[PDB]
Design a protein around this ligand. Structure first.
Ligand code: 6DB
Ligand code: CL
Ligand code: CL
Ligand code: CL
Ligand code: CL
Ligand code: CL
Ligand code: CL
Ligand code: CL
Length: 256
């Protein structure tokens, strides 16, 4: 059935999906998308779509798939189907190198949120108390915003159209902190450009964040999902996902 497909991406989330000097779409999602389509024997075409409206445009049939650093989270699973994860990454916090937030002790280094034990709640409640009075910035319509609204409601948040504006305002001093995956924050903080920025706090997984990043497909497209899952399994097994992860992220975030 599928001879050619249209894949949507945002183009504002480096190193997953962004634009080069000549304005062409580049990144991990573009390289993986093209490699998966070569395996599937499907012609590949990448389109730019803003984050707000990326899910409704998929359901409306404007394109066939989404490859835009999209977590397989339970709220999204109610609307669209996902492929098996092509990348696994926890979530962490971001601040400036001079922030007093960096002197706060982390009791639980890795925080799994599917089940929240009293000890895990105590750690989340500690950070909530510390984050009150502190200005937070998040990209709108992400699991970052969902986390802040559900798990830390007492904390003041500002929502941004893109993650680039969040980073811009954090450097300008208009916000004091943020949150994203380690897959986004490690290559951002590894840059000598961003020596003034630091990752801090616990590394969270599960709950509302779900498990991994997957390809977004329509629920009625069961055959396209099966094709993507077979292609992803083969790309993981031969070391392609590991090779592309080292290239774009500077570390191995591929599933095992
Ligand atoms: C991996 C990535 N996932 C977030 C943010 C992705 C936003 N993607 C985009 N702007 N293209 C999410 O699915 O809510 C992250 O937490 O860092
Ligand atoms: Cl491209
Ligand atoms: Cl093949
Ligand atoms: Cl799975
Ligand atoms: Cl431990
Ligand atoms: Cl190769
Ligand atoms: Cl290459
Ligand atoms: Cl590594």
């Amino acid at each position: 059935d599928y001879k050619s497909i249209t894949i949507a991406t945002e183009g504002s989330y480096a190193p997953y999906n962004f634009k080069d000097a000549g304005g062409k779409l580049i990144g991990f999602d573009i390289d993986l998308g093209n490699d998966l389509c070569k395996r599937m024997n499907i012609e590949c075409k990448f389109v730019e779509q803003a984050w707000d409206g990326i899910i409704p445009s998929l359901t409306a049939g404007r394109y066939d798939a989404i490859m835009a650093a999209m977590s397989i989270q339970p709220a999204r699973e109610k609307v669209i189907a996902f492929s098996r994860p092509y990348l696994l990454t926890p979530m962490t916090f971001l601040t400036t190198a001079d922030s007093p937030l960096l002197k706060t002790q982390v009791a639980i280094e890795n925080l799994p949120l599917d089940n929240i034990t009293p000890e895990q709640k105590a750690e989340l409640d500690k950070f909530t108390k510390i984050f009150e009075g502190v200005k937070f910035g998040v990209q709108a319509g992400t699991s970052h915003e969902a986390f802040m609204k559900q798990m830390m409601p007492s904390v003041q948040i500002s929502t941004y159209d893109t993650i680039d504006n969040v980073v811009m305002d954090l450097k300008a001093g208009r916000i004091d902190a943020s949150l994203a995956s380690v897959s986004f924050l490690k290559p951002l903080t590894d840059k000598p450009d961003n020596k003034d920025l630091k990752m801090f706090g616990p590394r969270m997984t599960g709950g509302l964040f779900g498990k991994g990043v997957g390809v977004g497909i329509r629920k009625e497209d069961a055959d396209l999902k099966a094709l993507f899952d077979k292609a992803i399994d083969a790309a993981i097994a031969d070391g392609t996902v590991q090779k592309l992860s080292q290239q774009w992220f500077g570390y191995d975030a591929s599933p095992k």
